[PDB]
Amino acid sequence: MMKPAKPLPKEMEEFVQSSGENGIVVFSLGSMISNMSEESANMIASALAQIPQKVLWRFDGKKPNTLGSNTRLYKWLPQNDLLGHPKTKAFITHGGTNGIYEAIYHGIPMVGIPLFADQHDNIAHMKAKGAALSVDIRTMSSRDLLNALKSVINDPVYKENVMKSS
């Protein structure tokens, strides 16, 4: 089924345009971040702050003290409309079936942060197709997340593989 995107809210479009040639990263839903330690959100924020891309982070916890100026926090996000925007370079998700279906539709490579059995299996399957990398925030470091992000954002083979998956 086709999953077409519609225009973004104006203020959100303006932030997305300010990424210029770098493009953006969408970290969407991330619904378990608010139930984890403050240190988890701080580790993610530190990694996200070190890429040149702008970052739209669907988030509702306390603002991380390591939040970078390139990253904005939103309690709600039009995830599908962001995945279909031409400036989107990578998708960070826990690995739910819904978001993976949209990233596949719009051809966006992924960094998975799986927590549950179905998310681990989904992300492992996309990784085996060369369309994603995975980090376990509970055991890996901020440097591990940064390395995964720079790879999926800048190496075209991940995008090319997720498009071969249609």
Side-chain angles (χ1 to χ4, degrees):
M1 274 189 22
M2 295 178 2
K3 308 171 178 67
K6 76 176 180 300
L8 292 174
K10 178 175 190 191
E11 295 180 356
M12 188 170 308
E13 173 65 24
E14 299 177 349
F15 184 61
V16 168
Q17 281 309 314
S18 73
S19 74
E21 293 291 329
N22 298 124
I24 68 174
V25 174
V26 182
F27 185 3
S28 173
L29 260 68
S31 55
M32 274 294 296
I33 296 302
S34 62
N35 303 125
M36 304 176 53
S37 58
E38 281 195 27
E39 296 74 355
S40 303
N42 286 334
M43 270 171 299
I44 291 162
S46 291
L48 295 172
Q50 297 170 89
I51 62 174
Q53 286 64 41
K54 304 291 189 177
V55 182
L56 293 86
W57 186 357
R58 213 298 317 170
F59 183 84
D60 52 44
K62 184 176 75 177
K63 178 180 68 185
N65 51 25
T66 57
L67 191 69
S69 59
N70 68 333
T71 305
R72 271 183 158 282
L73 305 171
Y74 300 88
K75 297 179 183 175
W76 162 90
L77 276 188
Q79 160 182 300
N80 186 65
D81 301 327
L82 285 163
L83 283 179
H85 197 285
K87 284 201 184 296
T88 296
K89 298 287 168 68
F91 177 44
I92 309 175
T93 177
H94 286 311
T97 294
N98 196 259
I100 292 182
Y101 262 73
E102 298 180 341
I104 291 176
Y105 180 80
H106 300 290
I108 306 294
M110 289 160 269
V111 175
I113 307 189
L115 288 175
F116 302 96
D118 67 323
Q119 295 168 349
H120 283 291
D121 198 0
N122 288 343
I123 291 303
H125 186 74
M126 304 300 297
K127 187 179 173 65
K129 287 178 167 188
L133 296 176
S134 56
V135 177
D136 192 335
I137 48 178
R138 290 161 303 176
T139 59
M140 292 171 164
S141 71
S142 184
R143 171 68 188 287
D144 297 319
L145 178 57
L146 181 65
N147 294 333
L149 276 176
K150 297 197 163 165
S151 291
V152 298
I153 291 168
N154 299 281
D155 183 350
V157 69
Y158 295 106
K159 170 156 198 101
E160 181 180 355
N161 286 327
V162 75
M163 296 191 296
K164 295 180 179 293
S165 295
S166 302

